[PDB]
Amino acid sequence: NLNAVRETMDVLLEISRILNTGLDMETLSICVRLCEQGINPEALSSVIKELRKATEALK
């Protein structure tokens, strides 16, 4: 199964790449597992942006 869950994860990177999302490979794996738990994505869209704002406040 792990060969299939690898390829469906790999095709999902390119649709997040040409859609100009800042998610790299590691945060994409984190977020696809977290959405696989069952959390609503409409709030993840807020937490990723808020973490990236509070990250910019240091630099």
Binding site: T8, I15, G22, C31, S46, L51, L58
Partner: protein
């Protein structure tokens, strides 16, 4: 491991160098922002509505690719619904292009003047780029070359 996936998400977005207490507060930022939405429509149509805006400003085959991948992803739907929200948040050759002088059976077209006009912008961007490079390397050091003494220097601020 839902309480740990937020802990590793808080580590990935933390930039590398206090790094031991900033995670402790960034997890509070994650939780304080995760609650505001939860205190308070198909999936592929949101992709098509962006594929349209792709096609209007040129770049046709990229939109034909964005639809091509989501036709294979059916044979998970809540993840692409997360990707379409962060669509504008990201950071800002092939000789087998138009090239009517190569092919097996090329059809009769005659002059186009609309591929050549977008072949001279493809180079106009190049020398407009390498001049803003020499406008942004001229300046970042001359702003240090003219000021008061010890402004741009870190050791004088000690």
């Amino acid at each position: 491991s839902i309480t740990q996936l937020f802990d590793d998400l808080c580590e990935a977005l933390l930039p590398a160098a206090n790094r031991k207490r900033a995670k402790r507060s960034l997890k509070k930022v994650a939780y304080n922002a995760l609650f505001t939405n939860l205190f308070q429509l198909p999936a592929r149509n949101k992709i098509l509505m962006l594929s349209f805006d792709l096609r209007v400003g040129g770049l046709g085959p990229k939109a034909d690719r964005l639809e091509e991948l989501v036709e294979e992803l059916e044979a998970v739907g809540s993840v692409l619904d997360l990707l379409v929200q962060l669509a504008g948040s990201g950071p800002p050759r092939d000789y087998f292009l138009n090239n009517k002088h190569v092919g097996r059976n090329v059809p009769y077209s005659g002059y186009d003047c609309d591929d050549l006009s977008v072949f001279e912008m493809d180079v106009q961007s190049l020398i407009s780029r390498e001049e803003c490079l020499c406008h942004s390397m001229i300046q970042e050091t001359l702003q240090v070359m003219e000021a008061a003494p010890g402004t741009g220097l870190p050791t004088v601020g000690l």
